[PDB]
Nucleic acid binder design. Structure first.
Lengths: 95, 147, 207
RNA sequence: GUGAAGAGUUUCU
RNA sequence: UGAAAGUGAAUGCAGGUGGGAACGCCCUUGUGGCGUGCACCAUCGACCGACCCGGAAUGGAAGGGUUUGAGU
RNA sequence: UUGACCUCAAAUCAGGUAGGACUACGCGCUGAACUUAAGCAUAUCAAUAAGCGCAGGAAAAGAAAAUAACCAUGAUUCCCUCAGUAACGGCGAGUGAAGCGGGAAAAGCUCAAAUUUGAAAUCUGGCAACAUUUCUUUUGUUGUCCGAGUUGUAAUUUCAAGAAGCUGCUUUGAGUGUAGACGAUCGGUCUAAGUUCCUUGGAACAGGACGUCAGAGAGGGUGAGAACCCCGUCUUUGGUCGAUUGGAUAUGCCAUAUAAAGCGCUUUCGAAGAGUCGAGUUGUUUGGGAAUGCAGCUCUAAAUGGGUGGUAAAUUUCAUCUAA
C-alpha cells in the first residue's frame, strides 16, 4: 500500500476491517436437500437427446467433437465445458 | 427595446433594407450549415478549417471523474494559505514549515511556473511536475504525495 | 447560408419544440407551497425533529473522495456497535441502510459516534404516560423541536497547519516515485509473463 | 411420431 | 499540447533590437539633441507540449533540430 | 340399481361484476408523410401527427441480477449540473444520453420455495342473534349448518436474512367528560365617520367653507371625480355540528395484562422463481458503436451458479448484484 494515486496497491491507507457475511452471496451453493431432489429427478427423467449425443462422443473419446456439439447446443463455451464435465462424471459413475 | 430598433426607421422604405434586386426571399443557399463541401467550401476552408473528417480514437463511455486533475502553479502556492499563516511563516525562521494541501484547495497536480520564496514549505499533492519539485527543493521545501 | 463570423450554428430546434416549452412562472408559488408543506409536517410531527439523523459518508470517485457528505442510513454493523436494534432504530428515527457496509474502521467509528451523540441528546417519551420504561425518559416537560444539523453537523476533515520537515521527506523524490510506480503498474503483467516463462521454460532443463 | 430393411460408434434412402 | 498513453511553461530587469505616448535634463528655436522608456507592430532569441533525431527489463535525465501548437 | 370422484352442461337459480363518456396530464400498441439534406434513396422530420386499448387524482417508476474502481456510494421520482459532452450520423445534413456532485421529498416491505402433522390451526356463503352508522341507506361480531381447500388454506421465515435448538434474557389496548387548537362554522357581528352651508348644474358624487373616521383612503353602486349615502374593506370574540382517548395527566379512568418480541456463547444448517437466463439469426429501436432495449424463429442451461463491469474471442483473477 504505497498510499499514492498510482501503483498496484494505490489508494489512501485506512484501517481495514472484516466485512460481514452477506447471505445473498451464498446463492449458488449446492444444498444437501437440493442435490437429493436433483438426483431423484435425474432418476425419474432421462437425458436430453443432445446430452446423450455428447455422452456417445465422450465414450468414443472424441473430445473436440463433444466440445463443439455442447458449444453449439448450449451457446457459450463456458456452459459447454461445464456440461461436458458433468456428463463425464456421470459416465464415470456409470462405468 | 422596440422603440430603438432599426425597423422603426425603415418604415416608409419599400425594400426594408434588403434591396430591390436580391430581395429577402426564403433560404436561397439552403438551411442551416448545409453545403459546406460544395458551395460553402470557400467560407468553410477559410474560416473553419478542419471541420470535415475524422481524427483520433473513439472512447466508449468516457467518464471525466477519474480524469479530474486541475493544476496550480508554484507562484500561487502561498496564495492558498490564510493571511495569518502567511504572516506567521512567509519570510520568517520557524522550527516547523507550513503545510499546503493542494488537493484540499481543489487541485490535482502542482506545476512549476514562476518563483518561490526561500522559506521552506510542505506541499501535499497527488501529482507534481519535475520542474515544480526541483524548485520546491531549491526553496527548501519538500513534496509528499497523497491520495 | 453561413457567411458571418463566429462558430457554426448548432441549434437543436428541428422538432415541434414549441409544444413542450416549460415555463417557470409558478416558481414562487412552488416555493411557497413547499414551505407551507414542511411547516405543516413540522407541526404534525412535533416535537420530533423535521429531519432524521444521517450518517457521514465519503463520496465516491477521486474527484469527491476528499469531502464528507450525508448518507442515507446507518449500517447494521454501526447500529450493533452503538447498541441499537434495527427494529427500534426506525421507531426512534434512525434510518437503516442495509446496502452500505463499513469497509474502514474510521467510517465505522465516525458513524457510531454520531449515533451515540444522537442517543445522548435524545429524549424518548414513554409509551405509557407517567410510567418510564427501559430506555425512556421522565423529563419530557422541556422537550421541543430542534434541528439535528445543529447538534450533529457534517464536519469535513481538518488539515494540518504545520509540521517539521523530516530527513526522509527531504530525501524523498516525488516525481521519480510517481514515474517509477506508474511504470511498475503498467508493466506488471509483462513481468508476470516473463516470470512464468522463466519458470516453465527453464524446468525443461531437469530431464 | 412408431416399427422393418438396406450404406460404404454413427444418419441417407 | 498530443489521436492517445502522458508530459506540462524564468539563463537574464520575465530577455535583446527598431519605431514609439507621456515625463525629466540641456541647446537655443529648431522638422533640435540626451535619458529612460506605457500601448501596439515588426524582428532576434529563451521556456512548455507534439514530431524528427543522435540517445550517453524499466526511465528519457542532459545535447539537439531544416519543424509543428488555437501556448508561456 | 345406487353412490362417490373427475370433466362438461342448463336455469328469468342466490348474490355480484364489465361495457359507455370525459383524455389537460398518465401507461402502451400501431404508425406516416409534408419538410431538411439547397437534388435524393440511408438519415431528418419522428420512435411525432392520425388510428386503437387501458387508469387515477395524479399516473408511471420504485426498494438493485444498481453504480463505480473511489478513503467508495446506495429504493424510486423531479430540478440544476454533467452536456450540446461521450457517442451516433451518404461521419453529409443533423442527432445525442449516463456515473459522480448540489437540492426537493424521503418509507419501507410482501409472497413461492420448510412436515402444524399431537390434531386445516384457514376462508366464502345460507340461516339466527347482537352490535355499528356521514346513513333505518353504512360496516361488522358471535353461534350453527353447508361449501372451498390436503393436486395445500393458516403460522415463523424472504437472504438485510432466517429455522432447529442451546441459552441468560425482560414485561401491556380500549369506551366517556373538561382547558387549548381544528374541518366546517354562523343567531353573523361592538366591527367608523357629513349626506351641514355657498356657487354651477336637470341631477353634486364638481369647486369652495366648516368638520369627522381611519387596524377601514381595495373595489362597486347611487341622476357627473363619494373614505364619512349604501354594499362593502380593516380589526375582531363568541354561539353550534363533527374529530373530541385528534392531541394534554385527554382526567373520571373501561381493563387492557400472563403470554409475547429483544441483545447474547454455540453449532447443524440455511429450501431462494426454466422454453427462463443465455447463444445464433431476423426485424425494429437507441448516443449505445463485431446488437442499447423490444419482438418472431432455432438451440437451450447451471449451482459458489448466474447477471453486470459500454470492442468481438479464449484463459486466469477481481469488484458488485442476486433476474426470470
Amino acid at each position: 500500500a504505497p498510499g499514492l494515486v498510482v501503483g498496484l496497491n494505490k489508494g489512501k491507507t485506512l484501517t481495514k476491517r472484516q466485512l460481514p457475511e452477506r447471505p445473498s452471496r451464498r446463492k449458488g451453493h449446492l444444498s444437501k436437500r437440493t442435490a437429493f431432489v436433483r438426483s431423484i429427478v435425474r432418476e425419474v427423467a432421462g437425458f436430453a437427446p443432445y446430452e446423450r449425443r455428447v455422452m456417445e462422443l465422450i465414450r468414443n473419446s472424441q473430445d473436440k467433437r463433444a466440445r463443439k456439439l455442447a458449444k453449439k447446443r448450449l451457446g457459450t463455451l463456458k456452459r459447454a465445458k461445464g456440461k461436458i464435465e458433468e456428463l463425464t462424471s456421470v459416465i464415470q459413475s456409470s462405468r | 427595446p422596440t422603440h430603438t430598433s432599426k425597423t422603426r426607421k425603415l418604415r416608409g422604405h419599400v425594400s426594408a433594407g434588403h434591396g430591390r434586386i436580391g430581395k429577402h426571399r426564403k433560404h436561397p443557399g439552403g438551411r442551416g450549415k448545409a453545403g459546406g463541401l460544395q458551395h460553402l467550401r470557400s467560407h468553410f476552408d477559410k474560416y473553419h478549417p478542419g471541420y470535415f473528417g475524422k481524427v483520433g480514437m473513439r472512447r466508449f463511455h468516457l467518464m471525466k471523474n477519474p480524469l479530474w486533475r486541475p493544476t496550480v502553479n508554484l507562484d500561487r502556492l502561498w496564495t492558498l494559505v490564510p493571511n495569518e499563516t502567511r504572516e506567521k511563516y512567509l519570510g520568517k525562521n520557524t522550527e516547523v514549515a507550513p503545510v499546503i494541501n493542494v488537493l484540499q484547495s481543489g487541485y490535482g497536480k502542482v506545476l512549476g511556473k514562476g518563483r518561490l520564496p526561500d522559506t521552506p514549505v510542505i506541499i501535499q499533492t497527488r501529482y507534481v511536475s519535475r520542474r515544480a519539485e526541483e524548485k520546491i527543493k531549491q526553496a527548501g521545501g519538500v513534496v509528499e504525495l497523497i491520495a | 447560408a453561413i457567411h458571418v463570423k463566429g462558430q457554426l450554428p448548432n441549434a437543436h430546434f428541428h422538432k415541434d419544440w414549441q409544444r413542450y416549452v416549460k415555463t417557470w412562472f409558478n416558481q414562487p408559488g412552488r416555493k411557497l407551497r413547499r414551505r407551507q408543506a414542511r411547516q405543516t409536517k413540522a407541526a404534525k410531527i412535533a416535537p420530533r425533529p423535521v429531519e432524521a439523523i444521517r450518517p457521514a459518508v465519503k463520496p465516491p470517485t477521486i474527484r469527491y473522495n476528499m469531502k464528507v457528505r450525508a448518507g442515507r442510513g446507518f449500517t447494521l454493523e454501526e447500529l450493533k456497535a452503538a447498541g441499537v436494534s434495527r427494529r427500534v432504530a426506525s421507531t426512534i428515527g434512525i434510518p437503516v441502510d442495509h446496502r452500505r457496509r463499513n469497509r474502514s474502521e474510521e467510517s465505522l467509528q465516525r458513524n457510531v459516534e454520531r449515533i451515540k451523540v444522537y442517543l445522548a441528546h435524545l429524549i424518548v417519551f414513554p409509551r405509557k404516560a407517567g410510567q418510564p420504561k427501559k430506555g425512556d425518559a421522565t423529563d419530557v416537560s422541556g422537550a421541543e423541536q430542534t434541528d439535528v444539523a445543529a447538534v450533529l453537523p457534517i464536519t469535513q476533515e481538518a488539515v494540518e497547519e504545520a509540521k517539521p520537515i523530516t530527513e526522509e521527506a527531504k530525501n524523498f523524490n516525488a516525481f521519480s516515485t510517481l514515474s517509477n510506480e506508474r511504470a511498475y503498474a503498467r508493466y506488471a503483467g509483462a513481468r508476470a509473463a516473463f516470470q512464468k516463462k522463466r519458470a516453465e521454460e527453464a524446468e525443461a532443463k531437469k530431464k
